[PDB]
Amino acid sequence: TAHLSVVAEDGSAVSATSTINLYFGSKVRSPVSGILFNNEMDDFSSPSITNEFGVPPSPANFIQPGKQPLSSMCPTIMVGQDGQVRMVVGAAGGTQITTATALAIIYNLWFGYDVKRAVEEPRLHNQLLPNVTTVERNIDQAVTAALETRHHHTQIASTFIAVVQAIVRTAGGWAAASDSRKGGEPAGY
Amino acid sequence: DNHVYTRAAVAADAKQCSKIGRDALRDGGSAVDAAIAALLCVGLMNAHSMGIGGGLFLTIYNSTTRKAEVINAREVAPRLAFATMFNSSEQSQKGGLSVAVPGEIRGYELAHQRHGRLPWARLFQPSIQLARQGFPVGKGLAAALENKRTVIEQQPVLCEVFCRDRKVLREGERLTLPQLADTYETLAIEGAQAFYNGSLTAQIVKDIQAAGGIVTAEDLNNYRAELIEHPLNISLGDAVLYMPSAPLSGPVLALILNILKGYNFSRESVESPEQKGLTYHRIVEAFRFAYAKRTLLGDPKFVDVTEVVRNMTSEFFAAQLRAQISDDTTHPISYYKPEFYT
Ligand SMILES: *[C@@H]1O[C@H](CO)[C@@H](O)[C@H](O)[C@H]1NC(C)=O
Ligand SMILES: *[C@@H]1O[C@H](CO)[C@@H](O)[C@H](O)[C@H]1NC(C)=O
Ligand SMILES: *[C@@H]1O[C@H](CO)[C@@H](O)[C@H](O)[C@H]1NC(C)=O
Ligand SMILES: *[C@@H]1O[C@H](CO)[C@@H](O)[C@H](O)[C@H]1NC(C)=O
Ligand SMILES: *[C@@H]1O[C@H](CO)[C@@H](O)[C@H](O)[C@H]1NC(C)=O
Ligand SMILES: *[C@@H]1O[C@H](CO)[C@@H](O)[C@H](O)[C@H]1NC(C)=O
Ligand SMILES: [Cl-]
Ligand SMILES: [Cl-]
Ligand code: NA
């Protein structure tokens, strides 16, 4: 999954999340065309397959011909009452896309973090099932303590949680950030 | 340099693709032109993540009309697919049967028809060059190649592009994508029809079927991107947030934020360890409440989700969930009332 954010000079914007699902998708590459095919079928729920320990199949998300599988993706645009774009944001990187997108928005809109800090700030994730709070390696350990004393079982992500690309309107113009977890960098004029 | 830009900006997960989008803007492209040009490039430099074998959503805001729309070009189950087609994770994750009908190119075409200002061909030109010439493997791809080294090294068709001396490419090492280069060129010249109902089509079908899949030409002929004039939105203070509804996760995001907005977070919410800790606790609990509802979601053309989605975007309903968040403890799964049937 990859996320891209664009603001043009006229103030129009695009938030674009695109995907072949898991890393290298189906692992089926055409030797002739070079196309690497998705494994988007895996985003469906299946009655036979046991998803997690204790996690049941969700009948709303079973395979049918011509049906689209549920997705964690959430490409988002925030527009101010005056009609000007305030933020262009989205995430990539698996099951944690929606919570990473929420965190980027919370960080900038509420905590007052500038866009680069909002993108780089440590993240955490809980999705109910499974029943565990994942935190990034460099999370403020007072947060870890505050979670544990409130009975969360936390664990540390062995790599990183999601990948966020974002743009935010400032006094200075359009402030852009790409997530160093993946190594991207913005460009503009 | 600073990454604050006076006039326009592109934020992608590879520098070169951010630049390629920036150059489209500079040459007179709309935001959509820039996004397509950048996406063609990400499909090369971050080939593990996305590309023309996949699907996408675009949330598009027009500053003139002040209207937001969404383009749904997510993959669909082939016409021959059925509920019990898989019996293990392995079957649904690897090989041709795991492949859904790609929507990427129809998605680009529709977004371009409605919003494009540069010629279609111009969008592919920089990426054709890049794929033929080669590029150093970036941080993200290198880590993905490392993660999947076993599967990649044992499959000759992947190792053909992704290895050097029979071992996965590492960061800094040159990646060339000579076949994609040709394919991108065909797309540039013949257009979207080349993929769905034209010169690439029979080969696509044959590659998916050789690997054990069930996609047919008719599946490709029938694929359609969809314009959604009314995305999900929620009101936040003096702002609106546009995001895609089901089958994407806008309703979950809407619910997370609507739950949290009633706590009135600000810089103060994270100013001391006592406040910070309570703040993050509250965030996690909102995540848990928001996910309880998620398992009732599915493709709205096959599942009736209007009620579910109406609840998930309602501030009242979010206020009801917020009043069940205990400031001193998390709870067991059943407390959040996850539901698997309506
Ligand atoms: C799995 O089992 C079902 C039901 O018996 C069958 O229809 C299907 O073809 C099988 N699929 C695979 C991929 O093994
Ligand atoms: C805004 O609307 C106009 C006219 O309806 C349309 O031509 C154009 O695509 C939109 N602007 C952008 C930048 O897409
Ligand atoms: C192209 O389109 C027509 C109808 O849509 C169909 O009859 C024909 O077989 C398609 N061709 C290919 C090569 O898929
Ligand atoms: C938000 O949601 C619905 C669209 O169906 C409607 O109430 C309204 O038009 C939307 N608001 C904005 C600002 O677009
Ligand atoms: C929506 O929420 C109300 C509580 O406000 C509940 O009674 C009703 O069952 C919900 N509908 C669905 C489809 O979840
Ligand atoms: C889930 O985790 C929480 C704390 O992390 C705990 O209260 C609970 O007993 C665990 N198990 C279930 C089944 O909810
Ligand atoms: Cl990304
Ligand atoms: Cl190639
Ligand atoms: Na930045």
Side-chain angles (χ1 to χ4, degrees):
Chain A
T1 316
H3 183 79
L4 182 101
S5 298
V6 183
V7 179
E9 201 175 1
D10 70 339
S12 283
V14 182
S15 203
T17 318
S18 166
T19 192
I20 59 177
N21 195 27
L22 299 185
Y23 281 9
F24 309 100
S26 63
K27 320 299 179 299
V28 182
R29 173 181 176 269
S30 173
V32 176
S33 81
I35 301 168
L36 186 54
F37 298 101
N38 71 81
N39 58 347
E40 222 68 56
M41 295 304 287
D42 193 56
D43 268 358
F44 285 108
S45 180
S46 293
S48 187
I49 318 173
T50 286
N51 197 24
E52 313 280 289
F53 176 89
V55 182
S58 317
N61 192 39
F62 287 165
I63 299 164
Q64 301 303 334
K67 199 182 176 181
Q68 295 183 314
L70 197 56
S71 165
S72 306
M73 291 187 298
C74 206
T76 294
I77 304 178
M78 181 186 283
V79 184
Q81 58 73 30
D82 66 3
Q84 275 192 265
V85 165
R86 292 172 56 161
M87 192 174 198
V88 181
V89 63
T95 197
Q96 306 102 337
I97 293 169
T98 315
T99 62
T101 303
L103 295 163
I105 293 161
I106 291 152
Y107 291 168
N108 177 264
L109 176 72
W110 292 334
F111 294 170
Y113 301 164
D114 62 73
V115 69
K116 185 57 172 172
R117 173 176 190 182
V119 165
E120 296 300 322
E121 184 72 17
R123 292 187 286 256
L124 74 179
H125 177 72
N126 194 309
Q127 63 191 42
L128 188 63
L129 306 129
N131 188 45
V132 54
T133 303
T134 294
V135 296
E136 287 187 305
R137 192 169 310 106
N138 58 332
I139 202 151
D140 183 345
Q141 299 156 106
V143 164
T144 294
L147 292 175
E148 295 276 341
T149 59
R150 288 168 176 85
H151 317 106
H152 301 257
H153 304 303
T154 67
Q155 60 197 62
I156 303 158
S158 54
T159 55
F160 62 81
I161 300 179
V163 179
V164 179
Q165 268 70 244
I167 298 169
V168 161
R169 203 173 83 246
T170 61
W174 302 105
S178 294
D179 197 329
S180 75
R181 289 164 190 78
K182 197 176 186 186
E185 173 167 344
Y189 61 96
Chain B
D1 280 20
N2 186 28
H3 312 301
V4 183
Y5 306 101
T6 317
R7 297 156 77 196
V10 174
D13 65 14
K15 190 184 189 199
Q16 172 75 280
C17 308
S18 294
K19 284 157 70 188
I20 279 174
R22 186 278 309 289
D23 299 340
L25 289 176
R26 205 181 257 158
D27 292 351
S30 68
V32 162
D33 293 316
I36 295 168
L39 293 158
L40 288 158
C41 169
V42 172
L44 303 181
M45 304 192 82
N46 287 314
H48 65 296
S49 302
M50 63 150 287
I52 63 173
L56 84 162
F57 261 67
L58 307 103
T59 300
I60 304 166
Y61 181 69
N62 186 326
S63 65
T64 299
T65 59
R66 301 167 179 203
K67 262 127 76 82
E69 65 192 48
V70 160
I71 291 154
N72 168 356
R74 180 159 175 82
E75 307 99 301
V76 283
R79 72 182 178 92
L80 296 164
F82 53 101
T84 54
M85 64 193 288
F86 305 120
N87 311 299
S88 54
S89 286
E90 195 69 51
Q91 306 170 348
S92 67
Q93 292 186 351
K94 201 175 182 316
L97 198 65
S98 81
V99 180
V101 187
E104 197 86 3
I105 290 300
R106 281 298 186 206
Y108 298 168
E109 182 187 46
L110 185 63
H112 195 251
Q113 287 171 350
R114 300 180 45 77
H115 304 284
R117 282 201 273 269
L118 299 169
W120 181 255
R122 161 70 181 79
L123 309 175
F124 290 81
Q125 204 297 300
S127 285
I128 291 160
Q129 267 203 32
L130 200 60
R132 285 217 184 98
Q133 177 179 25
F135 47 92
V137 173
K139 176 192 198 161
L141 179 49
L145 284 164
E146 171 56 41
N147 186 266
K148 288 295 154 206
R149 66 171 323 117
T150 318
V151 58
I152 285 175
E153 290 171 359
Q154 64 180 20
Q155 173 65 236
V157 182
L158 284 173
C159 221
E160 177 71 4
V161 292
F162 291 124
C163 308
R164 202 185 75 119
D165 313 318
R166 298 155 295 110
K167 308 253 263 167
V168 297
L169 295 169
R170 275 160 311 164
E171 182 173 357
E173 289 180 350
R174 179 140 308 242
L175 174 55
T176 52
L177 298 158
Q179 287 76 54
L180 271 184
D182 291 351
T183 298
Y184 271 30
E185 173 151 32
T186 300
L187 291 166
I189 305 313
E190 308 179 7
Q193 219 75 0
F195 191 102
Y196 294 90
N197 179 220
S199 71
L200 310 167
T201 309
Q203 183 62 55
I204 291 169
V205 171
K206 154 170 188 209
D207 296 313
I208 300 164
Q209 292 178 15
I214 58 174
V215 169
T216 63
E218 297 65 30
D219 285 314
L220 291 155
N221 303 162
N222 296 340
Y223 188 86
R224 294 293 183 279
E226 170 193 38
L227 170 68
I228 292 157
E229 325 247 17
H230 309 294
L232 217 54
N233 72 64
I234 59 159
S235 171
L236 238 41
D238 293 352
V240 62
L241 266 78
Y242 298 104
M243 56 200 80
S245 194
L248 264 60
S249 291
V252 183
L253 187 52
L255 187 46
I256 287 160
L257 297 176
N258 276 345
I259 289 162
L260 294 170
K261 77 161 169 218
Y263 293 118
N264 299 121
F265 290 160
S266 67
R267 294 178 163 222
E268 284 153 64
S269 314
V270 286
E271 210 126 66
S272 62
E274 292 88 354
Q275 287 211 253
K276 200 157 176 198
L278 176 49
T279 290
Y280 277 72
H281 171 68
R282 283 165 171 181
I283 291 176
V284 175
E285 287 302 293
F287 287 170
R288 290 167 69 72
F289 272 108
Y291 271 83
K293 319 303 167 200
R294 185 179 190 279
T295 42
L296 295 176
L297 296 180
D299 184 340
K301 302 188 194 303
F302 293 66
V303 178
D304 189 353
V305 295
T306 34
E307 292 298 287
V308 181
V309 167
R310 162 162 31 248
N311 272 359
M312 295 180 75
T313 51
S314 149
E315 306 166 287
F316 187 61
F317 177 79
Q320 307 189 298
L321 306 183
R322 207 225 323 144
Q324 294 170 78
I325 295 172
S326 314
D327 283 349
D328 57 298
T329 187
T330 189
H331 294 269
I333 288 155
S334 65
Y335 181 83
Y336 305 91
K337 297 187 173 71
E339 302 162 71
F340 304 93
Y341 290 79
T342 315

